[PDB]
Amino acid sequence: VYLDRKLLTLEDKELGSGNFGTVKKGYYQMKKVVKTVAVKILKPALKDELLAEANVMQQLDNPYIVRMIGICEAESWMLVMEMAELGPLNKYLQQNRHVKDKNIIELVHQVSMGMKYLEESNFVHRDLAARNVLLVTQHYAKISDFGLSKALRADENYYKAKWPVKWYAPECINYYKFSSKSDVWSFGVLMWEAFSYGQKPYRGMKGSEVTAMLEKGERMGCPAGCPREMYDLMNLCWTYDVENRPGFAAVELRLRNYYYDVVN
Numbered sequence: 001v002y003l004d005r006k007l008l009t010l011e012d013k014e015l016g017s018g019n020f021g022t023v024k025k026g027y028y029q030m031k032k033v034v035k036t037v038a039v040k041i042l043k044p045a046l047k048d049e050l051l052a053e054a055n056v057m058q059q060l061d062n063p064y065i066v067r068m069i070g071i072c073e074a075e076s077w078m079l080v081m082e083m084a085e086l087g088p089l090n091k092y093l094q095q096n097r098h099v100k101d102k103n104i105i106e107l108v109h110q111v112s113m114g115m116k117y118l119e120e121s122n123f124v125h126r127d128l129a130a131r132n133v134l135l136v137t138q139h140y141a142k143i144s145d146f147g148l149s150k151a152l153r154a155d156e157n158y159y160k161a162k163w164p165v166k167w168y169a170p171e172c173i174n175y176y177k178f179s180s181k182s183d184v185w186s187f188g189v190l191m192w193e194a195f196s197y198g199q200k201p202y203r204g205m206k207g208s209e210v211t212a213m214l215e216k217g218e219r220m221g222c223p224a225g226c227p228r229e230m231y232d233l234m235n236l237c238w239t240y241d242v243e244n245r246p247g248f249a250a251v252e253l254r255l256r257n258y259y260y261d262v263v264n
């Protein structure tokens, strides 16, 4: 878990920024091979946020989740993760419009598998969005950014709490209640983004107006070229009633079936 700072080389080129500090590309020397890494580098008591993130990531072990290599303490705190070279899903899709619906299905299914695993592990992501899906290849996606994630208690199926309101289920807004079903809501939004080639959801609207729209039963439209069955799934993810909204097992199962029908 604790990494040697002298085995780590960080590139001066920044990769991304935020109110924690930065993220940078680098290399971690293993026994005989060098591993390319993404390093989240810490700049009041937000130290414990990073350790919590690392603590969540240490427990997760799935192909469709970004792997933690370890933590490094030196000059600043540093969370070392494996590198996904192609970067965020939404930016990739914005710049690669030729990508085919079948490819997008493949990627969203991969995300659904990662989230099904996360659901089984009783973790809530609480920030599932296309920006937080990182591409290893055009055909391999991983879920990133566990800074807001929580391990559910063995007796509860939800967590009670600056929010990405556009990705949030009604019960998150109305009751501050975060569950794997609320991750499912966010996945619907993520799907909409993917099939819109990285377009922003609820363009030009304030959170309060988004909340108002959803309350009236209104939902985002079916993106250009999006198969109707995938849009059906988005709407199912946007089921207002948490209890009737499906879990990731059923969401994943629907994606799996549809995808392997497309390869047949």
Ligand SMILES: Cc1cn(-c2nc(Nc3cc(C)c(OCCO)c(C)c3)ncc2F)cc1CN1CC[C@@H](O)C1
Binding pocket: 015, 016, 023, 037, 038, 040, 066, 081, 082, 083, 084, 085, 086, 087, 088, 131, 132, 134, 144, 145
């Ligand atoms: C916590 C964290 C981990 N990572 C990682 N990034 C990468 N690869 C990567 C990331 C970006 C943003 C990226 O785009 C750089 C700007 O074009 C590219 C080409 C690769 N590989 C592995 C990682 F673990 C990135 C972050 C920062 N997040 C902020 C919002 C979300 O987009 C990412």
